[PDB]
Amino acid sequence: ATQTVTLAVPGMTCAACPITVKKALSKVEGVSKVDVGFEKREAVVTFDDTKASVQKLTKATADAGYPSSVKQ
């Protein structure tokens, strides 16, 4: 498939959480795109559910350095 979810990365590293998380989901695996929003420490990513999914998105920012979650 090809869907996009939002993620919760409360790392607030000051202009760093949204940089490391963005590249995390963008490189998670099947991701097709990614983004971030310091307005609520969350990262939004688009991808192909055939090779990835929310689980892998939160896992990408999670391996980036932030215990995050997802908003489906």
How is the chain split into domains, by residue range?
Answer: 1-72
3-state secondary structure of 10: coil
**CATH number attached to the domain at 1-72:** 3.30.70.100
Residue list for the binding site for Hg(2+): 14, 17
Fill in the amino acid letter for 11: G
What distance in Å separates the CA atoms of residue 13 and residue 54, rounded to the nearest whole number? Answer: 22
What distance in Å separates the CA atoms of residue 43 and residue 59, rounded to the nearest whole number? Answer: 12
Experimental method: NMR
Which segments of the chain are extended strands (E)?
3-8, 31-37, 42-47, 69-70
Residue list for the binding site: 14, 17
